[PDB]
Ligand binder design. Sequence first.
Ligand SMILES: [Zn+2]
Ligand SMILES: [Zn+2]
Lengths: 146, 146
Amino acid sequence: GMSLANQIDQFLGTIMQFAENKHEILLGKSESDVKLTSTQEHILMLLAEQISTNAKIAEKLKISPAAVTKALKKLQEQELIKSSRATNDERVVLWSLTEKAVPVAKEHATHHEKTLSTYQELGNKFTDEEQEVISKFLSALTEEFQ
Amino acid sequence: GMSLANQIDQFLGTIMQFAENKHEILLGKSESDVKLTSTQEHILMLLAEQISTNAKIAEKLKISPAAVTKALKKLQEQELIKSSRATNDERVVLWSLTEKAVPVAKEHATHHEKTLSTYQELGNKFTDEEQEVISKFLSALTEEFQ
Ligand SMILES: [Zn+2]
Ligand SMILES: [Zn+2]
């Protein structure tokens, strides 16, 4: 009392509320208009790190060529990325950020960093043995929502 | 590896996906069209148990008279509840289910029962000491989403 079952129920309620109208669960971020899909945001983060081919994007983000094609089309339309030709091979297209996209990618990277660091700091309050309990709990609970 | 931080991130992703387009996190329920708000569903559950006044509904569900008034209006329009006059006092209105609502309330009650029992069975796999760890974890994580 409160029972753990009820605590779990209430926790999931909290998460549902926070998640409403969002593409991703991210902390330290102000409410705003959803401009880009998560895949689009993640392509921009990848390109901030390395100019990349369609193939490399699919590989890194673990998504299909169709998904990559769709996201790139939208990003290019919004003038957030630009294509170029690989000097080694005339057939190979590379993608890079436009200046417009630089702060967009930086902002999204920051949101992920803040979110992960928040979870890390929380986890750091628990010993390995306790983290194992939490991990087993999360794994089991995850199975219920498949 | 996977780090607990990453496990938490992925877990919350799973929950976000499950929660999309839903009023409540409920298990053992098939996908369907959202006909009623959660408050409306909960009034029906309450009335299945006891014919009740507006005041009693607000008390039991811990919501305001305005919230109760709004939900009752919609339920009555859908012919899911009906008013009657308390025999003791001509001024006191009581609400009861219509036959139409009986299976609706039963179904929603079942969903809550299934959901809670699922969490209970999961919790039952952990000792009290382990449940305390989980509880502390959930409490702390909840604070991040306020
Ligand atoms: Zn993201
Ligand atoms: Zn409910």
